[PDB]
Swiss-Prot record:
The keyword DNA-binding does not apply. It comes from the Bacteria. Belongs to the CRISPR-associated CasB/Cse2 family. CDD domains: Cse2_I-E (cd09670). This is CRISPR-associated protein Cse2. CRISPR (clustered regularly interspaced short palindromic repeat), is an adaptive immune system that provides protection against mobile genetic elements (viruses, transposable elements and conjugative plasmids). CRISPR clusters contain sequences complementary to antecedent mobile elements and target invading nucleic acids. CRISPR clusters are transcribed and processed into CRISPR RNA (crRNA). The keyword DNA-binding does not apply. The gene is cse2. InterPro entries: CRISPR-assoc_prot_Cse2, Cse2_sf. Keywords: Antiviral defense, Plasmid. One of its GO terms (biological process) is defense response to virus. Gene3D superfamilies: CRISPR-associated protein Cse2. Homodimer.
Amino acid sequence: MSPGERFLDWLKRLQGQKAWTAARAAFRRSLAFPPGAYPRAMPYVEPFLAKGDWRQEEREAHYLVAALYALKDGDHQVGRTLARALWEKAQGSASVEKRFLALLEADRDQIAFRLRQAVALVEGGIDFARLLDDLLRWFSPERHVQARWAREYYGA
């Protein structure tokens, strides 16, 4: 499995437990703070991160995805990437495309905010496994993830 698929399994397992209500509450509330900076969400993510070796930016990626997953009430739709979901949303609103481009152009200080805004903007579920795999590689000098998102958007 990929890091994204592994984390998705973890989130799905959590959502199936009685502790979900509390977990969702923590993840949802964490959207008001920088990823990885909300204490109550930590007990629900650290046990997972402990199984691997991560850099701070990578831990933050997991926290942000958990928060966005909760925002969408765990509606994971394999194959429906955020880029594709944004294209669908843009058909009814041309301005959505400018938000999409700004998302692709976001740097370390803008990505968390713009990603939360983009997920909140689209209708329905998205692929949270691919979302994490992509966020984890977002800062590659090549910007290959960004180019692929553009491919998915204009390809739709």
